[PDB]
PDB file of C-alpha atoms in Angstrom:
ATOM      1  CA  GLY A  28     -29.972 -45.549   7.055  1.00 30.24           C
ATOM      2  CA  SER A  29     -27.555 -47.995   5.391  1.00 25.77           C
ATOM      3  CA  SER A  30     -28.548 -50.882   3.610  1.00 26.83           C
ATOM      4  CA  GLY A  31     -24.579 -51.940   2.128  1.00 28.40           C
ATOM      5  CA  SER A  32     -21.022 -50.851   2.429  1.00 31.85           C
ATOM      6  CA  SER A  33     -22.355 -47.451   2.612  1.00 26.60           C
ATOM      7  CA  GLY A  34     -21.573 -44.004   4.300  1.00 26.06           C
ATOM      8  CA  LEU A  35     -22.346 -40.457   5.112  1.00 28.18           C
ATOM      9  CA  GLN A  36     -18.463 -39.676   5.755  1.00 29.01           C
ATOM     10  CA  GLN A  37     -15.002 -41.614   5.958  1.00 28.79           C
ATOM     11  CA  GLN A  38     -13.202 -39.313   7.228  1.00 28.22           C
ATOM     12  CA  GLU A  39     -11.154 -36.598   5.248  1.00 30.82           C
ATOM     13  CA  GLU A  40     -13.236 -33.685   3.649  1.00 31.52           C
ATOM     14  CA  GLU A  41     -11.248 -32.087   0.099  1.00 26.54           C
ATOM     15  CA  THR A  42      -8.573 -33.146  -1.898  1.00 28.65           C
ATOM     16  CA  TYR A  43      -7.061 -29.569  -3.829  1.00 32.87           C
ATOM     17  CA  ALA A  44      -4.224 -31.491  -5.984  1.00 33.20           C
ATOM     18  CA  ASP A  45      -4.390 -28.969  -9.091  1.00 34.81           C
ATOM     19  CA  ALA A  46      -4.354 -25.523  -7.386  1.00 34.92           C
ATOM     20  CA  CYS A  47      -1.211 -22.976  -7.835  1.00 34.00           C
ATOM     21  CA  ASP A  48       0.895 -21.174  -5.431  1.00 32.99           C
ATOM     22  CA  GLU A  49      -1.425 -18.227  -6.446  1.00 31.68           C
ATOM     23  CA  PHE A  50      -4.462 -20.062  -4.151  1.00 31.90           C
ATOM     24  CA  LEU A  51      -2.518 -22.037  -2.055  1.00 29.87           C
ATOM     25  CA  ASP A  52      -1.531 -21.048   1.565  1.00 30.35           C
ATOM     26  CA  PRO A  53       1.902 -20.247   2.011  1.00 28.72           C
ATOM     27  CA  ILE A  54       1.644 -21.278   5.404  1.00 28.22           C
ATOM     28  CA  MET A  55      -1.305 -23.464   5.340  1.00 32.54           C
ATOM     29  CA  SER A  56      -0.755 -25.072   2.378  1.00 37.28           C
ATOM     30  CA  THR A  57      -4.052 -25.056   1.570  1.00 38.69           C
ATOM     31  CA  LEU A  58      -6.892 -23.656  -0.637  1.00 40.21           C
ATOM     32  CA  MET A  59      -7.313 -20.110   0.658  1.00 38.55           C
ATOM     33  CA  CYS A  60     -10.730 -18.700   0.414  1.00 39.64           C
ATOM     34  CA  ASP A  61     -10.286 -15.642   1.856  1.00 36.92           C
ATOM     35  CA  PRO A  62      -6.799 -14.235   0.845  1.00 41.53           C
ATOM     36  CA  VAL A  63      -5.662 -10.807   2.927  1.00 42.66           C
ATOM     37  CA  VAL A  64      -3.062  -8.805   1.501  1.00 41.96           C
ATOM     38  CA  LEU A  65      -0.489  -7.896   4.213  1.00 41.53           C
ATOM     39  CA  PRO A  66       0.425  -4.744   4.003  1.00 40.76           C
ATOM     40  CA  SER A  67       3.695  -5.219   6.167  1.00 40.89           C
ATOM     41  CA  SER A  68       5.660  -8.524   4.710  1.00 43.77           C
ATOM     42  CA  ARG A  69       3.167  -8.096   1.501  1.00 41.07           C
ATOM     43  CA  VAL A  70       2.381 -11.659   1.463  1.00 42.11           C
ATOM     44  CA  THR A  71      -0.611 -13.632   0.955  1.00 42.29           C
ATOM     45  CA  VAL A  72      -2.509 -15.628   3.335  1.00 42.32           C
ATOM     46  CA  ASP A  73      -6.040 -16.594   4.401  1.00 41.56           C
ATOM     47  CA  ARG A  74      -8.150 -14.465   6.417  1.00 39.33           C
ATOM     48  CA  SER A  75      -8.189 -17.016   9.345  1.00 40.57           C
ATOM     49  CA  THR A  76      -4.821 -17.999   8.688  1.00 38.36           C
ATOM     50  CA  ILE A  77      -3.581 -14.484   9.694  1.00 38.25           C
ATOM     51  CA  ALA A  78      -6.023 -14.504  12.758  1.00 35.87           C
ATOM     52  CA  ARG A  79      -4.441 -17.073  14.024  1.00 33.75           C
ATOM     53  CA  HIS A  80      -0.879 -15.415  14.351  1.00 34.33           C
ATOM     54  CA  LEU A  81      -2.760 -12.132  16.246  1.00 34.67           C
ATOM     55  CA  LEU A  82      -3.932 -14.283  18.505  1.00 32.79           C
ATOM     56  CA  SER A  83      -0.820 -13.459  21.520  1.00 33.23           C
ATOM     57  CA  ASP A  84       1.683 -11.548  18.827  1.00 34.00           C
ATOM     58  CA  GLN A  85      -0.667  -8.718  17.006  1.00 35.79           C
ATOM     59  CA  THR A  86       1.923  -9.082  14.456  1.00 38.79           C
ATOM     60  CA  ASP A  87       3.403 -10.664  10.810  1.00 38.14           C
ATOM     61  CA  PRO A  88       4.744 -13.869  10.942  1.00 38.63           C
ATOM     62  CA  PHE A  89       6.693 -12.955   8.125  1.00 41.73           C
ATOM     63  CA  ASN A  90       7.761  -9.075   8.822  1.00 42.30           C
ATOM     64  CA  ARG A  91       7.125  -9.663  12.853  1.00 40.35           C
ATOM     65  CA  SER A  92       5.953  -6.403  12.680  1.00 41.22           C
ATOM     66  CA  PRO A  93       2.821  -4.100  14.309  1.00 41.17           C
ATOM     67  CA  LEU A  94      -0.124  -5.806  12.605  1.00 40.33           C
ATOM     68  CA  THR A  95      -3.760  -6.260  12.903  1.00 43.09           C
ATOM     69  CA  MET A  96      -6.812  -7.706  11.378  1.00 42.06           C
ATOM     70  CA  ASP A  97      -7.053  -3.396  10.993  1.00 41.68           C
ATOM     71  CA  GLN A  98      -3.968  -3.402   8.972  1.00 37.83           C
ATOM     72  CA  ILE A  99      -4.495  -6.787   6.941  1.00 37.70           C
ATOM     73  CA  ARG A 100      -7.483  -5.791   3.363  1.00 37.45           C
ATOM     74  CA  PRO A 101      -9.046  -8.740   0.915  1.00 39.28           C
ATOM     75  CA  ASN A 102      -7.065 -10.168  -1.719  1.00 39.69           C
ATOM     76  CA  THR A 103     -10.272  -9.713  -3.736  1.00 40.54           C
ATOM     77  CA  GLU A 104      -7.938  -8.883  -6.705  1.00 39.36           C
ATOM     78  CA  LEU A 105      -7.553 -12.657  -5.952  1.00 40.26           C
ATOM     79  CA  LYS A 106     -10.378 -13.587  -4.418  1.00 42.40           C
ATOM     80  CA  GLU A 107     -12.108 -13.035  -8.363  1.00 42.15           C
ATOM     81  CA  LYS A 108      -9.382 -15.409  -9.969  1.00 45.90           C
ATOM     82  CA  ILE A 109     -10.638 -18.138  -6.840  1.00 47.76           C
ATOM     83  CA  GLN A 110     -14.287 -17.717  -8.268  1.00 46.71           C
ATOM     84  CA  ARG A 111     -13.235 -17.752 -11.876  1.00 48.33           C
ATOM     85  CA  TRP A 112     -11.583 -21.360 -11.068  1.00 45.70           C
ATOM     86  CA  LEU A 113     -13.799 -22.930  -8.903  1.00 44.21           C
ATOM     87  CA  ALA A 114     -16.706 -22.541 -11.395  1.00 41.88           C
ATOM     88  CA  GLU A 115     -14.111 -23.650 -14.010  1.00 41.81           C
ATOM     89  CA  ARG A 116     -12.416 -26.447 -12.713  1.00 43.94           C
ATOM     90  CA  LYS A 117     -16.360 -27.751 -12.347  1.00 43.30           C
ATOM     91  CA  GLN A 118     -16.074 -29.469 -15.824  1.00 43.77           C
ATOM     92  CA  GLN A 119     -16.289 -33.150 -15.073  1.00 47.64           C
ATOM     93  CA  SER A 120     -16.445 -35.247 -18.312  1.00 44.45           C
ATOM     94  CA  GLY A 121     -20.303 -35.344 -18.761  1.00 43.51           C
ATOM     95  CA  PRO A 122     -23.111 -37.483 -16.587  1.00 44.15           C
ATOM     96  CA  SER A 123     -24.607 -40.274 -17.970  1.00 44.57           C
ATOM     97  CA  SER A 124     -28.073 -41.648 -16.597  1.00 46.77           C
ATOM     98  CA  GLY A 125     -29.333 -43.167 -20.135  1.00 45.15           C
TER      99      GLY A 125
END
């Protein structure tokens, strides 16, 4: 349990204020974990960001043409870049216990 001025989580979860547009979603404006390349609009969007748009109208949010989950492909060229930054960004100054 708690002891004094403690807590599990006080709202919010993350805070990416140092990511380039290449990683940030064009619509969600947030970090992209699974960026999919749209073969229609040629735009990079999260695999989940597109799914929400392919719920009632299976098409592109920009091109507005025939599009589906099978059409969109995973942006490996970008995903590989996110792994390099997400791993490099975690540098910090250096803990100190002693």
